[PDB]
Design a protein around this ligand. Structure first.
Ligand code: POV
Ligand code: POV
Ligand code: POV
Ligand code: POV
Ligand code: POV
Ligand code: POV
Ligand code: POV
Ligand code: POV
Ligand code: POV
Ligand code: POV
Ligand code: POV
Ligand code: POV
Ligand code: NA
Ligand code: NA
Lengths: 525, 115, 115, 63
């Protein structure tokens, strides 16, 4: 206070490299101004002292285009690490500013403070902004949540949808769904306007487009199966049935024409989608773009077998059978239309990655290691009788140990071994390591995996269905986007018309006299 | 018994039948004709025959012969091992683990449901 | 204290910081700089790193008597010190040990199978 | 604990000239006529706000 009264500049910018650090541990970014420093260090009395001075510019920008509200979003952390002061500093500065100038400003990346909070995964700040309700009368128009009517314990509220629904580019909903960097997407979709908005899109258009996608892909697999199982098997009946290489006026010819056409449409559509969302991270290849990859491989193998028969290279039948088997396995994509089967597919993905791959690595080491040792103990069988041992080579010994694991066939300990006691010692040691130890430990480790991921599997499923909804929404014509319209136009303030989403509520615990409302008469009007 | 059938068993059977019928057609269409000199040269000679062989493999009955009448013997063995990993290693063992979660929840309420 | 496994006393000594001015040189942890919430500290390594005999790090790793070795290695200067040795030299010597032992098993297998 | 035993066994089979190349820590002046080898660790703390009095360097950058 002594320095400010003597003429200290309240608008200085500390712009050195220590104040704009390349790595986190080498400095401290705070927004470069004395007002931003006092806010980020939890000094509320100096913040009040600075804003009362009429030389303080509350709407200035730093070197990267951030204002005071962008900087508070950048330093925010969760409640276990930082408590709640940053959210309290956001509210105090915004109400003093008194208009919408700060929250509509864009930084050098072109992002508002609301867009920046979604981009960086700041879930505590995002919850506060989306449901901000100001009951005091002169500052009421800065709200994003409004009370429409109330009677006793029952009330009806309206949520502002301005930059959060997908009617504009880089909306809050789109940023959260496609953000492969952060790790808390499935927690942020539980928040209040976002959850009902995805529910409304599913009920109106998205559930019917999902059923029609299932029916076309099922009929595609039926026809591909029937023309491959019922090929002309005669050596004299050369021509392959698919695509009608010899026009014969055969009825139901359109299925053979459907498969060649529909495989091209998949290969173009999945060729574009892999291009636009390319991952630089193997964890994001498995978690977002897996079924884009396997639908693309299946459609290429169908096209590649067509060219191999038209040149008659005989390897076309191998490409067809791999395409049929992968095609029926691809039907597990459509389980995400249901909650019960969708959560079950989430469990399958986690168990393969955490449990099954570790088992297979150790099992193959024991299989190939004991296989060579048993095979090199067997003598030559060139003398009088053939077929004197089933362990006569490395390939033969590995097959016998594999059949033992899955319990098929018979067990003969009387081989052509030089040392029969040593042969039986190594065989029993293999049984203890695999039948007693590794297979039973796999069941016990899966029980630990099921216990952990069952807490989160519902929220992981809803994130997967949300990506399906927004992809269906982009392929609609613009005249049909106007027919399916979320929200209603409402007058929330004097000369202020906003599109809003209605949510009802019943609350029995906090009794108050209702003062702030948009309508005196509480019915549906 | 009633809770385990509805929560666990029905979900298993749906995914298992998809893998059984899907791998069954692919293996059966890879087998050549056996009209030449000897009969009984393959046990995977039709769709009905291939489904029966994969079912017996699951419950562990009979013998395993990899020497069928396939045009591509390496491709035949690749698809057969993939079926074993999906069913013997993955789905049957995951069923036991999911039943353990069901038993833990409903054991709190099963006395009052009986009364 | 390291020899007898006294983990509470050992934690206190390794990170002792005295902020009072005339007795400040008895510290083993020093603040180098600080700005707001960010700071950078220095830990004394005199008799704890393996540059001398019977150091604190060597005593803990080879102490077969006590039962809490794996809890004492979580303490603050010891944890980063093992991380630094792995990144600079130890991870490359581990890979070279693997390659020599793998080639030894390949050759022993091939000359015994192809006698 | 198992990996730690592997690290110290690798460290003993190195030549003495190569032990000097891989050297943990930096030489620092912690007091008047007192030079010690030290290991640096960074930290961020949001909960206890205090005026900073005890430090070795006024200027807080990497120097
Ligand atoms: C390119 C070929 C692949 C298969 C090759 C086989 C060996 C290579 C194996 C490589 C490693 C396998 C690891 C896969 C990990 C993810 C699996 C998965 O998504 O789980 C899903 C279970 O349903 C399935 O799809 C899994 C069944 C196994 C694959 C099918 C075997 C092939 C069948 C015929 C063989 C013909 C093979 C012809 C070509 C050789 C459910 O997961 P989710 O919870 O819903 O989340 C993911 C979805 N999301 C990303 C959209 C959000
Ligand atoms: C615990 C249970 C689990 C076990 C699993 C592991 C156990 C593996 C068990 C292996 C036993 C089989 C080997 C015995 C040798 C037989 C003879 C033979 O033909 O060998 C041939 C090689 O054959 C191959 O190359 C095998 C191809 C499959 C590779 C692994 C499958 C990939 C699974 C991915 C899917 C992942 C699923 C997706 C993930 C969700 C060559 O040998 P040969 O001497 O020249 O034979 C004559 C050749 N001829 C026949 C053409 C004339
Ligand atoms: C009011 C509710 C409906 C409103 C909208 C309806 C109009 C449609 C709107 C816009 C037009 C569609 C744009 C392109 C269509 C290409 C088709 C295609 O390639 O398959 C696509 C499905 O695509 C679907 O959306 C399924 C429905 C087929 C649409 C056919 C339009 C004619 C309507 C019906 C014609 C007569 C049927 C009459 C039935 C009574 C591919 O499926 P995918 O899931 O996108 O990708 C695969 C999964 N993956 C992500 C893992 C890779
Ligand atoms: C089941 C088959 C067994 C055999 C398959 C073997 C392979 C198995 C593979 C995978 C197993 C899963 C199979 C996929 C299931 C179907 C997809 C689906 O999810 O539908 C869903 C909706 O869809 C509907 O609306 C119901 C269909 C009514 C007819 C509407 C036709 C659309 C045309 C109209 C427009 C004409 C426009 C065209 C002309 C312009 C049903 O899900 P739900 O839970 O009811 O949704 C409510 C969810 N909620 C409550 C959470 C909010
Ligand atoms: C036992 C009596 C004696 C035998 C009777 C034998 C004949 C029986 C005939 C018909 C009964 C067959 C089951 C239908 C009812 C299932 C109820 C259910 O939970 O569905 C759930 C998913 O489950 C699915 O629907 C996924 C697909 C299942 C395949 C059957 C198609 C369903 C349409 C029937 C057409 C028949 C086709 C099949 C013909 C066999 C609903 O999905 P969800 O709501 O999103 O998730 C629930 C979670 N939640 C509740 C918290 C939200
Ligand atoms: C199957 C067909 C061929 C596939 C081969 C290549 C597929 C590899 C491609 C992708 C999977 C690799 C992991 C990427 C994502 C990490 C997540 C994860 O769960 O990984 C886990 C397993 O990973 C391991 O460390 C297991 C060791 C060997 C796996 C690879 C060789 C397969 C072994 C023989 C198979 C061939 C058999 C074929 C013949 C029978 C890491 O362990 P975790 O601590 O529990 O992870 C927790 C999550 N975390 C990382 C965030 C901490
Ligand atoms: C995409 C990647 C995934 C691929 C699958 C997953 C990777 C799988 C890894 C490996 C699979 C293949 C192993 C290499 C051996 C080749 C086999 C062979 O050719 O047989 C030949 C050489 O056989 C020999 O010389 C003896 C065996 C040599 C290797 C020793 C195995 C122990 C390795 C233990 C540790 C290994 C694993 C460690 C843990 C993972 C001769 O055999 P035959 O019976 O006389 O053939 C008769 C037919 N013929 C006469 C016409 C020729
Ligand atoms: C710290 C303690 C752990 C390690 C201890 C050892 C240190 C390891 C160091 C050296 C190994 C010692 C063996 C020397 C090599 C000679 C091999 C040989 O000649 O074959 C012999 C068998 O051999 C076996 O079956 C047993 C070999 C393993 C013994 C270790 C027991 C493990 C504990 C489990 C205890 C139960 C296992 C008992 C199962 C018998 C005999 O050969 P043959 O086939 O009989 O001759 C032809 C047949 N004829 C007689 C008709 C003419
Ligand atoms: C078996 C003989 C033929 C029967 C066919 C028809 C029988 C269907 C009739 C009645 C059962 C349907 C459910 C009604 C009551 C719901 C309660 C429930 O537990 O359902 C669960 C399973 O439901 C599923 O979604 C599984 C998907 C397919 C089931 C139906 C096809 C059977 C698959 C192939 C079978 C044919 C094999 C025949 C040849 C081998 C829903 O999942 P959940 O989340 O865990 O539920 C928790 C409770 N909740 C709903 C309150 C949330
Ligand atoms: C109440 C409801 C419950 C009922 C049970 C539960 C439902 C079960 C569902 C389905 C069971 C039946 C499947 C349909 C095929 C009929 C079989 C047939 O007739 O064989 C004929 C046609 O065979 C073919 O043409 C090839 C197979 C065509 C279908 C492809 C299966 C893959 C589906 C994968 C996904 C499907 C499932 C998805 C997940 C659920 C010929 O076969 P054959 O061997 O040459 O016959 C010899 C004798 N003969 C010459 C005298 C004629
Ligand atoms: C992102 C990565 C995942 C996907 C990767 C691939 C992308 C998918 C895209 C295209 C598929 C590529 C194959 C092209 C089609 C040709 C088929 C063919 O000719 O049959 C071949 C076998 O084929 C096989 O057995 C292996 C086929 C699957 C390979 C994928 C490995 C999965 C990982 C698991 C790793 C272990 C699996 C290794 C098992 C060998 C050879 O035919 P044949 O029977 O030998 O000929 C007659 C016998 N004769 C020689 C005596 C004359
Ligand atoms: C900057 C990073 C590197 C700096 C150091 C590099 C120089 C090395 C420093 C000192 C010299 C080594 C002293 C003796 C070596 C004897 C070898 C021996 O017996 O095997 C030992 C491995 O030993 C190893 O450390 C693996 C590396 C081989 C060292 C060969 C030196 C030439 C470098 C490369 C030559 C050309 C290759 C070129 C490659 C591009 C035994 O392994 P173990 O794990 O100790 O014990 C077995 C496990 N157990 C504990 C359960 C029992
Ligand atoms: Na059995
Ligand atoms: Na058996």
């Amino acid at each position: 206070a002594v320095l400010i009264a003597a003429g200290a500049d309240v608008n200085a910018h500390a712009k050195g490299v220590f104040f704009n650090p390349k790595y986190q541990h080498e400095g401290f970014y705070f927004g470069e101004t004395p007002l931003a420093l006092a806010a980020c260090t939890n000094q509320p009395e100096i913040v009040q002292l600075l804003m009362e001075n009429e030389q303080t510019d509350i709407t200035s920008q730093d070197s990267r285009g951030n204002n005071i509200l962008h900087a508070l979003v950048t330093v925010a952390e969760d409640f276990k690490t930082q408590n709640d002061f940053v959210k309290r500093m956001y509210d105090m500065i915004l109400l003093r500013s008194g208009n919408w100038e700060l929250e509509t400003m864009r930084n050098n990346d072109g992002l508002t403070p609301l867009q920046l909070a979604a981009k960086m995964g700041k879930a505590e700040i995002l919850k506060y902004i989306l449901s901000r309700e100001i009951k005091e009368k002169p500052l009421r128009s800065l709200s994003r949540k409004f009370t429409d009517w109330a009677y006793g314990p029952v009330s009806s509220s309206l949520y502002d949808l301005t930059n959060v629904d997908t009617t504009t580019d880089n909306s809050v909903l789109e940023i959260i769904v496609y953000n492969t960097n952060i790790d808390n997407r499935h927690e942020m979709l539980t928040l209040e306007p976002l959850h009902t908005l995805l529910h409304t899109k599913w009920k109106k258009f998205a559930k019917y487009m999902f059923f029609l996608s299932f029916c076309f892909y099922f009929f595609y697999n039926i026809t591909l199966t029937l023309v491959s199982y019922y090929r002309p098997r005669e050596d004299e009946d050369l021509p392959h049935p698919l695509a009608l290489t010899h026009k014969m006026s055969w009825l139901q010819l359109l299925g053979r024409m459907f498969v060649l056409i529909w495989a091209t449409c998949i290969s173009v559509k999945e060729g574009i989608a892999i291009f636009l969302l390319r991952p630089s991270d193997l964890q994001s290849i498995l978690s977002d773009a897996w079924f884009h990859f396997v639908f693309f491989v299946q459609a290429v193998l169908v096209i590649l077998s067509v060219f191999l028969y038209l040149f008659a290279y005989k390897e076309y039948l191998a490409c067809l059978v791999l395409a049929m088997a992968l095609g029926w396995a691809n039907m597990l994509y459509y389980t995400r239309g249901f909650q019960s089967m969708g959560m079950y597919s989430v469990m399958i993905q986690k168990v393969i990655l955490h449990d099954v791959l570790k088992f297979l690595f150790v099992y193959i080491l024991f299989l190939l290691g004991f296989g060579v040792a048993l095979a090199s103990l067997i003598e030559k069988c060139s003398k009088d009788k053939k077929d004197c041992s089933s362990y006569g080579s490395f390939s033969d010994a590995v097959l016998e140990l594999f059949k033992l694991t899955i319990g098929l066939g018979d067990l003969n300990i009387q081989q052509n071994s030089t040392y029969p006691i040593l042969f039986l010692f190594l065989l029993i040691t293999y049984v203890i390591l695999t039948f007693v130890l590794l297979l039973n430990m796999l069941i016990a480790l899966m029980g630990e995996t099921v216990e952990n991921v069952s807490k989160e599997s519902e929220r992981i499923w809803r994130l997967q269905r949300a990506r399906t909804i927004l992809e269906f929404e982009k392929m609609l014509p613009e005249w049909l986007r106007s027919r399916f319209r979320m929200g209603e136009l409402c007058k929330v303030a004097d000369e202020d018309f906003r599109l809003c989403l209605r949510i009802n509520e019943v609350k029995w615990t906090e009794w108050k006299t209702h003062v702030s409302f948009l309508n005196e008469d509480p019915g549906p009007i």
